[PDB]
């Protein structure tokens, strides 16, 4: 009756964190479980976090949302991984593209259980897809558009034409990005950090360059104005090994 679904969100509050206090942010990645609402209608809402500093309450910002392509509880076997790029790693990434468009480059990969989980290769047979959460970014390195919304489904799909094989379809039928929420979240972290650690403006020159998922700065270094909350603290670790699955699949 109902597809499984993945909704990724971020819970943030203002608090005194440690700076290894100081005034910055307490954040944690969370999943919202809803297969009822129409896709793209999650709201920013107060979470369960409170602030030791001033009694303020956390807010929860839906970031993105992806429905599974097919009915059934088995759709709950679909999920994904996501991580930001860094001028610290083994692989490189499109540094001039980022420069030009002042946005951050991310890698997303689809996965399936049984779990390590199994990696769903893209059509062109790559292990992962290079994306930006912003529109208009075109990469000369990968000669592709990078915007997730425009490219993911399409990339894990293959109508079979010049391919000659059985049409291939993506396990996720659409990737909806909450642009406004993301911009709201990045600004928040950009501001906080420019204040806390103003040298960080050297490579983080725009709010659009903020990694709001794994909270690494471009240089590779985790922002000094964020204190991340892992599973110990009600959170979810994203990243190369950070597995998240759709849910709420119903058979009827």
- Cβ atoms of 128 and 177 closer than 8 Å: no
Q: Which of 58, 79, 59 is nearest to 4 (CA)?
A: 79
Degrees, nearest 5: CA angle 76-80-86 = 165
Q: Count of domains in the chain? A: 1
Strand bridging mode 244-245 / 78-84 = antiparallel
Radius of gyration of the chain (CA): 18
- Strand-pair partners of 109: 81
- Cβ atoms of 246 and 4 closer than 8 Å: yes
Length of the chain: 252
Q: Which of 169, 123, 118, 173 is nearest to 4 (CA)?
A: 173
CA pair distance 187, 208, nearest whole angstrom: 8
Q: From residue 36, how far is each of 10, 39, 67, 79, 247 by CA, in Å?
A: 20, 9, 11, 19, 12
Domain that residue 144 falls in: 1-252
DSSP secondary structure letters along the chain: -B--EEEEEEEEEEEEE----EEEEEEEEEE---SSSPTT----EEEEEE-TTT--EEEEEEEEEEEBSS-SGGGGGEEEEEEE--TTSSS---HHHHHHHT---EEEEEEES---PEE---TT--S-EEEBSSTT-EETTTTEE-BHHHHHHHHT-B-STTT-SS-B--SBS--EE-HHHHHHHHHHHHHHHHHH-GGGGGT--SGGG--TTT-B-TTS-B-TTEEE--GGGT----STT--EE-B--B--
Contact residues for 249 (Cβ-Cβ < 8 A; gap 6+): 2, 3, 4, 35, 68, 71, 72, 73, 74, 75, 76
Elucidated via: X-ray
CA pair distance 225, 215, nearest whole angstrom: 10
What burial letters (b/e) apply to 63-72, b meaning 16+ CB within 10 Å? bbbbbbbeeb
Q: Which of 2, 72, 29 is nearest to 243 (CA)?
A: 29
Question: Tokens 């489904």 label which residue?
Answer: 153
Contact residues for 158 (Cβ-Cβ < 8 A; gap 6+): 123, 165, 167, 168
- Cβ atoms of 127 and 93 closer than 8 Å: no
- Cβ atoms of 111 and 120 closer than 8 Å: yes
Report residue 77 CA to chain centroid gap: 19
- Cβ atoms of 84 and 91 closer than 8 Å: no
214-222 long-range contacts, Cβ below 8 Å, gap at least 24? 214/82, 214/83, 214/84, 214/238, 214/239, 214/242, 215/27, 215/189, 216/84, 216/86, 218/85, 218/86, 218/87, 218/98, 218/104, 219/86, 219/87, 219/88, 220/86, 220/87, 220/88, 220/89
């Amino acid at each position: 009756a109902n597809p499984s679904r993945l909704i990724v969100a971020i819970e943030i509050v203002e608090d005194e964190i440690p700076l290894t206090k100081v005034d910055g942010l307490k954040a944690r990645i969370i999943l919202i479980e809803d297969n009822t609402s129409e896709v793209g209608t999650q709201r920013v809402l107060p979470g369960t976090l409170v602030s030791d500093k001033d009694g303020s309450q956390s807010l929860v910002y839906p970031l993105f949302e992806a429905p599974v392509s097919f009915f059934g509880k088995l759709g709950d076997s679909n999920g994904m991984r996501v991580w930001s790029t860094t001028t610290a790693d083994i692989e490189e990434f499109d540094e001039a593209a980022m420069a030009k468009f002042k946005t951050r480059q991310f890698r997303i990969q689809l996965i399936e259980k049984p779990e390590s989980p199994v990696i769903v290769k893209t059509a062109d047979q790559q292990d992962y897809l290079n994306i930006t959460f912003d529109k208009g970014v075109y990469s000369d390195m990968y000669n592709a558009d990078l915007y997730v919304g425009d490219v993911l489904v399409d990339s894990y799909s293959d109508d079979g034409v010049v391919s000659g094989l059985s049409p291939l379809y993506s396990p996720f039928s659409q990737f909806y990005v909450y642009h406004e929420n993301i911009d709201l979240v990045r600004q928040m972290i950009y501001d906080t950090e420019m204040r806390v650690n103003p040298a960080a403006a050297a490579h983080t020159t725009a709010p659009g360059e903020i990694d709001f998922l794994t909270f690494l700065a471009v240089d590779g270094d985790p922002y000094q104005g964020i204190q991340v909350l892992g599973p110990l603290d009600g959170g979810i670790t994203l990243g190369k090994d950070g597995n998240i699955y759709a849910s709420g699949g119903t058979d009827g």
